[PDB]
Amino acid sequence: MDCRTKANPDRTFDLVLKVKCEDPVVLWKFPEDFGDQEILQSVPKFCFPFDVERVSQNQVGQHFTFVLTDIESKQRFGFCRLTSGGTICLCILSYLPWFEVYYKLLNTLADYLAKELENDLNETLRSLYNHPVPKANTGLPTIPESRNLTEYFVAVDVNNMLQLYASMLHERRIVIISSKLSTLTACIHGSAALLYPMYWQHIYIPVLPPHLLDYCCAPMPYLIGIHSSLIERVKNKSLEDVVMLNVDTNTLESPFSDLNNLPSDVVSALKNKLKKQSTATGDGVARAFLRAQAALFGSYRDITFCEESFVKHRSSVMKQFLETAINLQLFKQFIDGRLAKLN
Amino acid sequence: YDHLFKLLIIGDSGVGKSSLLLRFADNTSYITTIGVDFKIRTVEINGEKVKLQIWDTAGQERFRTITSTYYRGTHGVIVVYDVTSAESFVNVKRWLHEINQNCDDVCRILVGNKNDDPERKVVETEDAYKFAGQMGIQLFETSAKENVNVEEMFNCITELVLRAKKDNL
C-alpha cells in the first residue's frame, strides 16, 4: 500500500541485456528465452533515453537507473552502465533496489565480456538468477556509500534541495533536467527517498525517453527526468504548470512559492544542517530530512486519524501547511498504511 | 482543433479501464511501462471540433482515497467500477465523496463496466443509481467487451465538459 518496491519478487533480477544503437539493437540477453516482448521493445529505448543523433559523442561513461512501473505501480529498476560515446549500454532489470551491488555487477559483466569469458559470465548469471532472493548479507542512506543520495547532494545546491522538497510536499508536477543520466536518475531517486517514511505515490519516471515526451503533458502529479538534449522539444509542448530544475546550471523555475509555505524554523534548521561540513558524511543528510519530516508531520500522533485535530495548530504558517498536507496522496498513504498495521 | 479537454479515468485495476481506453481512442498502452497512459479522441459536437485526451495511471486500487491533488488541471472524470466486484464499488463511493467535497468543479460520471456476465454480477443497478442520484451525477452501465453503452457514456462526459466551459464563459 505505502512503498513502491515489490516486497518479495520472484527473482533477484529478471533480465540482463547488452544493447547498441531504426531502434537500438539487442546484441545479447540473459535469459536467452526471455519471453516478455513488451519489455524487450521498451528496455532498449530506456537504455538510450536521449537524442542519440545529436549528443552521443558528449556522453561520458556512467551508471544510471531507469524505472519502469508495473500494473501495481511497483518499480522495476533498470540498472545501466553506459559506455563513453553513448553507443553501447549494459542493463540489468530487477525489482530489487540494489544500486551499489548492480553497478558493481555491471562493471564485472563488462570485464567478463571484454576478456571473452563466456562460461564464467553464464555461470555467474545462472547462479544469481536461480538463487532465491537473499534477505540477509549472505537503514538511512549515507554519503558517499549510497550513490543516489551522494550524487544528488554533490550536484544540487542546498537551496534547490529545499525547493524540490517543498514542491514534493505540494505534489507538484516536477521535471528535473541534466546532461548526465547518472546525475539525472540520481536526483530523482535521491530527492524522492528524502520523503521517508513517506513515498512519492504518483507518476515516477527517473528518465523519460524521447518517444514518451508527450507524458510531460500529464495533468496529475509527477516526478520526471529528462536528458538535456530533449528539454527544448518538451518546452515546445503545451504543458500544465510545472516545476523545473535544470541541474546543469542549478536553475529552478516554478510559478509557485511552495517553499514559502513551509514553517521557517523547520526550513532554517534543515538548511543550517545541510551546510554543515560534518553533515556531508554518513547519515547526516538523511537524518536532517528525516527530522524535517518529523517536525512537519510528526503531530500526526493523535483506531483512527482525526483530520481536524491534526490541522489545529497555533501558528498560521503551520496550520496553513497542515491543511494542505492532508490533501497529499503521499501523506494519505502513509497514514492509511499506519492505520492498517496498528491492527 | 477548436477546443481541448482533459479527462481522467479512475478505478481499480481489473475493471476494464484499458479496454475502455481502446474504445475511446481514435487510433490504437504504456500503463505497464511508465505507470501512465493517455488516449486521444476527436469528436464534432454541433459543428465544433473537440479533442479529448484521457489519462490513466497504474495501481489506483491501492488508494483508499484519491486526493484532490490528482485532479488539478482536469475537466472531467470517468469513475469506473466492475459490476462483478463489490469492493470496486465501495472504493468508487469514497472517491466520489472526496471529489464532491474537494473538487466539485470537476465533471464526473459513474460507470459500471463488465455488464456482460449476469451469473457473476453483484452490484445491483438500483444501488448504483441511488448513489449516483445522491451525488447529483449520471450513471452508465457498459460492456467494453461487447461494446455496449460505451459510446453513449463517452458522449455524456464530453457534452458535460463542453457545457461547463460555455456556462463558465
Report the CATH number that the domain containing residue B18 is assigned in CATH.
3.40.50.300
* Distance in Å, alpha carbon of A103 to nearest chain B alpha carbon: 22
Give A212's contacts in chain B (Cβ within 8 Å). Answer: 30, 33-34
Overall number of domains in chain B: 1
Residues 6+ apart with CB under 8 A from A166: A258, A259, A261, A262
Task: Using CB atoms, pick whichever of A38, A73, A214 lies closest to residue B59.
Answer: A73
The dihedrals phi and psi of A227, each to the nearest 5 degrees, come to: -65, 145
Query: What resolution, expressed in A, was reported for this entry?
Result: 2.1
Helix residue ranges per DSSP H, chain A? 37-47, 52-55, 99-114, 118-129, 147-155, 158-168, 181-193, 231-235, 264-274, 284-297, 307-310, 316-325, 329-341
Tell whether B31 is within 8 A of chain A (Cβ): yes
Q: Nearest-CA neighbor of A258 among A274, A275, A240, A241?
A: A241
CB contact under 8 A, A69 and B34: yes
User: Cell numbers 532554517 label which residue?
Assistant: A268
| Kind plus residue range of the DSSP H or E element containing B145 | none
Q: Is B12 annotated as a binding residue?
A: no
The minimum CA-CA distance between A239 and chain B, rounded to whole Å, is 10
A·B CB contacts under 8 A:
98
Domains in chain A: ranges and CATH: 1-138 (3.30.450.200), 139-302 (3.40.50.11500), 303-343 (6.10.140.1000)
The verdict on A20 touching B (C-beta cutoff 8 Å) is no
The answer for B 125-144 residues in CB contact with A (under 8 A) is none
CB contact under 8 A, A74 and B59: yes
Q: Which of B118, B116, B139 is nearest to B16 (CA)?
A: B116
A 71-100: CB under 8 A from B = 71-74
Q: Three-class SS of residue A249? A: coil
CB-based contact, A255 to chain B, within 8 Å: no
Could you list the residue range(s) of the whole structural domain that residue B31 is in?
1-169
Spatial distance between the Cα atoms of A149 and A141, rounded to a whole number of angstroms: 7
C-alpha cell at B18: 484499458
Q: Which residue has the cell 508536477?
A: A173
